[PDB]
């Protein structure tokens, strides 16, 4: 009665901390906001986080809920 | 109005002495009176809920809010969002007028009235009572009554405990057995 699975979706972090990226570059693919958009980072309809400016990827924990945020530090 | 005037003129002084309250703000106040009719029969007939609403309107002097089932219940054969009751919230002047009318006229008109229970406080100083017949209220006309409808009356108070709540009602000489 088993024998089924779906195709792997290649989610996860595409650009890690300190990596230089061009504007538009996808930083993380995810289901829901496991990571939240910080400064110079946009959130797509599928919760993809992407660079809105050229710069270095920066991961940070912030706010009362200690949520993880991704920001781009301008070069 | 009169009962509100009475509250300020007499009730506050009696309660202040009784409980040795430090401040007037400590003295219990009647926040609101809510009149509710649970019209289960409404599911069969929509008109019955409308008639119940009209009765509640006449007693309250205020257009009732229709209430609907929070969740589906198989036992009562009700689905969520189906209108099964009506309520009115009385505050300020309208509340005091109703409170007066209830004590002065409606409560005496209750059949075989032997006083109201003093054990009907919820533990937080709020008093709830049920009216078996809408006839007791003078606004309703016995001749034009299609069906006998009861209602449940709750008096919400700022009283911290039942003792403070009963004292407040007693100050107004609310009838208690």
């Amino acid at each position: 009665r088993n024998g089924r699975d779906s195709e792997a979706k290649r989610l996860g972090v595409k650009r890690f901390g300190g990596e230089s990226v061009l504007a538009g570059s996808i930083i993380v693919r995810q289901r829901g906001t496991k990571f939240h958009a910080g400064a110079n980072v946009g959130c797509g309809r599928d919760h993809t986080l992407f660079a809105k400016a050229d710069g270095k990827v920066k991961f940070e924990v912030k706010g009362p809920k200690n949520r993880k945020f991704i920001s781009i530090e301008a070069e | 109005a009169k009962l509100h005037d009475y509250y300020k003129d007499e009730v506050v002084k009696k309660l202040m002495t009784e409980f040795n309250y430090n401040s007037v703000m400590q003295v219990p106040r009647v926040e609101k009176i809510t009149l509710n009719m649970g019209v289960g029969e409404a599911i069969a007939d929509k008109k019955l809920l409308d008639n119940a609403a009209a009765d509640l309107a006449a007693i309250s002097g205020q257009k009732p809010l229709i209430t609907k089932a929070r969740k589906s219940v198989a036992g009562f054969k009700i689905r969520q969002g189906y209108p099964i009751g009506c309520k009115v919230t009385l505050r300020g002047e309208r509340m005091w007028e109703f409170f007066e009318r209830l004590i002065t006229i409606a409560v005496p008109r209750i059949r075989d009235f032997r006083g109201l229970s003093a054990k009907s406080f919820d533990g937080r100083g709020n008093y709830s009572m049920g009216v078996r017949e809408q006839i007791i209220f003078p606004e309703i006309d016995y001749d034009k009554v299609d069906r006998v409808r009861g209602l449940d009356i709750t008096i919400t108070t700022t009283a911290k405990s039942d003792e403070e709540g009963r004292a407040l009602l007693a100050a107004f000489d609310f009838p208690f057995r």
Binding site: - | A58, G61, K63, T104, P108, R109
Partner: protein, 60 residues
């Protein structure tokens, strides 16, 4: 209060057998005559064996 949605509510005179007269706002409109009120009701006013029976009926 919202306008045009509520029952007409006006002061009316309520008269009782005891002679207590009360002017109250109501939807009733017409003046009311009451059989009883808080003033005259028995409960409010406070107006509300076998061995004795045997002795009375069969006193010898």
């Amino acid at each position: 209060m919202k306008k045009d949605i509520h029952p007409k509510y006006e002061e009316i005179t309520a008269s009782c057998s005891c002679g207590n007269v009360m002017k109250i706002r109501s939807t009733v409109g017409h003046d009311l005559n009451l059989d009883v009120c808080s003033k005259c009701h028995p409960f409010f006013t406070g107006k509300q064996g076998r061995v004795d029976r045997f002795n009375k009926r069969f006193n010898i």
